[PDB]
Design a protein around this nucleic acid. Sequence first.
RNA 1: GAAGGGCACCACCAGGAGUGGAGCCUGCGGCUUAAUUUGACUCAACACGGGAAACCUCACCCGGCCCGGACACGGACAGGAUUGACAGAUUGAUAGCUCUUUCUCGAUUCCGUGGGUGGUGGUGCAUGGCCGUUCUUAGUUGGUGGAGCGAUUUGUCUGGUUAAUU
RNA 2: UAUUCCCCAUGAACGAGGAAUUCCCAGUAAGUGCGGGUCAUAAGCUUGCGUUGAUUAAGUCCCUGCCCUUUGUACACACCGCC
Lengths: 104, 52, 71, 124, 98
Amino acid sequence: AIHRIRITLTSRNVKSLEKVCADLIRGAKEKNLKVKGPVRMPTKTLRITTRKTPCGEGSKTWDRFQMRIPKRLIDLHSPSEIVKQITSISIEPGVEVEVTIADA
Amino acid sequence: GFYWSHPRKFGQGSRSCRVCSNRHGLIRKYGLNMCRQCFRQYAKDIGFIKLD
Amino acid sequence: KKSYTTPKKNKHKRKKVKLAVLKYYKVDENGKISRLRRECPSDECGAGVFMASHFDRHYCGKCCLTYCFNK
Amino acid sequence: GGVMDVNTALQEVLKTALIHDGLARGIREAAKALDKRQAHLCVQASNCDEPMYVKLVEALLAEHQINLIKVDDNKKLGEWVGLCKIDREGNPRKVVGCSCVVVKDYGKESQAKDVIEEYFKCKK
Amino acid sequence: MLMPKKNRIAIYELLFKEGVMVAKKDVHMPKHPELADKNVPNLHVMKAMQSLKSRGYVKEQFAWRHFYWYLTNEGIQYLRDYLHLPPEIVPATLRRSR
RNA sequence: GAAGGGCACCACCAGGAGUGGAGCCUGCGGCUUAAUUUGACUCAACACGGGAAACCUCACCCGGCCCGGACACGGACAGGAUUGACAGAUUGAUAGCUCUUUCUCGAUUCCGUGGGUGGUGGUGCAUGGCCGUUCUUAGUUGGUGGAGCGAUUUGUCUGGUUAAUU
RNA sequence: UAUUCCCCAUGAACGAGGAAUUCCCAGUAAGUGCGGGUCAUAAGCUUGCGUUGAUUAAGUCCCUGCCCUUUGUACACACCGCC
């Protein structure tokens, strides 16, 4: 075995991240062990501000190009089964999943 | 094969648009290196969506 | 725009000389080859490498075209 | 196909040495190839003005590292080596005289290389 | 049948070895991933391949400054006859499927 | 420079802030200048082309190099097509870019012809897209009716209302 | 051809701006730094961000310009017209 696993869920789509995030809670609590539920980091807003205009002219209008990236993370304690079950299931959309070994 | 030599290492000599090799108004930030127009083309596809 | 006058000195595009080059090879009686003049110090241009008299120049041509000195 | 007609046993070895990149091909590279083990096989011209040039060949050729052949005519001596860029469909390609090459690294093996270098070293 | 022989003879046989040869449009690389025994960047590659297409023994795309060199069935002959390569040859698209 | 209604602080009122004055900044204009490349001309051109530029940028001038002439079509086997040349005359340059010498790669080379290939060349009154704006102003359209032979017209409006044929 | 910065040193006009004219009503104007963008070097540039935070209109069409309706119109390159 039982080691200090962190699962770091980073994705853009809040809804398609929190269907996965819920399935790891409900996937672990099925075969119960521990957790400390989903952590909510500040959402990072990737904000670009370019001119609307190609070339010069016209009254100066710009767009406000944004991309969000919310990070959840979920602590757990398990063997090399429950990790390799819970991570490989509940994948699919534009969702990145990290797996820390223990502590550091 | 010799001579074609300077700092092509900093200065806009070096950096250019990844889409079209034009060398102004360049979105350096955030490891894009698109020209500012080549944003609005390759923008939705990237992920920057206009919200407010 | 302008229309280019050009200072009347229309610079020469030049031929690298014609030259048969290899007639000057001293075959003394039977088959044996070696003349003497000035030499270059290079490796691919190994000892046979050969030199001159110009309005100055002299050159050595045998690390394919890599390596002509300054004389 | 490729069973060696008349004067086409030197032609496949020259065409495969051409393309295998290594032909000490002339009085100069020929003599700097014959000066070392860089030389192997050759095709000299019968016709030769100031035959000191054929003599420099012959004299080097006849040493250890034994070479020779003969092949009559200057005007033929190249078109079974490499020397045409296709331009014009019926091949009228090129046209001056021809002379003494030094065939290095044959091409690979076989084709004409068991024909000419078994037949030259043992003309019997 | 052209240019730096050592480099360009290797570019042909690279392209015959492979199904597809990508590149980049950049004269100043001194290299190119896989092959590049020596230098042979865009230029020696391009100069070769932009020959191959125009005569007809290769076909292009471009797509964000790169050159998408795809080998033509006629070229199969041009380059194997350039490279004396075996009359079976099998370039690369041997392609065990299912 | 008709009339009723309605509305906007790119309008005013009531102000403050300024702005317009000075120095400075840099934007343009002009002159000057070989060169001060250049687009942009009321508003909706003027720190705008993301336009804060030593070199690059850069195109432009005073030069000067370099060839990267694809491709084919022609021309060039060898007394080696000139692939590619370490000391000096030079040149800016250790640019064989050129004036002798020659020593190698060695089937490349070179010279024609057609034809490209680019070009921050030209033309935004030849165009695509994208943008600017008339204009965050209230407007626009059709099915069926009804009116007009029919273009057209009503629906789409006197008034109250409303930020807004809402 | 003061790159940018520092350290010295010189040490200007300006004592509120002539004719005009934009900006806007609530956390608003203004000041105020600070980030971002621009960047090797680097911003008096913009775009955001707080922070300190006022006065005053809360209405009208008086100027400028917009909407509808009715109307006149020899204008329809539409009054910057036509004559």
